[PDB]
Amino acid sequence: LLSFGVPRKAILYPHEEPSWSLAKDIVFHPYWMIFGEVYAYEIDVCANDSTLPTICGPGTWLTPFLQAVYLFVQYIIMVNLLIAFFNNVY
């Protein structure tokens, strides 16, 4: 989760000062991704259907690649390993 959250925030929000909101932003949306949410119209902030058009900038085309890797790891590896854990220890 943190491996994803910290780059996502740093790439999309560079002009930020220190604040405790940084601690929420690196942890909040990545957690909710585990639970069926995708933030579809926040991926690819430079698209025409985007809800974050003010956030388009240099290097933002990276964040869809990052999130694709993130959810591959959490669901296809880690959620199913956890299912497999319980099935074999029940």
Added chain:
Amino acid sequence: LLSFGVPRKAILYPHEEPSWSLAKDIVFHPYWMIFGEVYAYEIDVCANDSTLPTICGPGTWLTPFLQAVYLFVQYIIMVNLLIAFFNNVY
């Protein structure tokens, strides 16, 4: 994923020139479908609650049938096979 993505794009967007955006569009939404997103108001683009009314045209009534088959295959067959793989190899 590609078996679905290529027809979906071709039927809904016919008047397109060559571009590398075609490589994103055949792969992007089908991937996010695996992870709990449905794009509910983009199915049946000719409906009244649709968010893509400019995309209604000849042959677009096919894309709900395609997506129904797609998700049947990915979740009910392929995600559960993968769960069954891990449970039996753990």
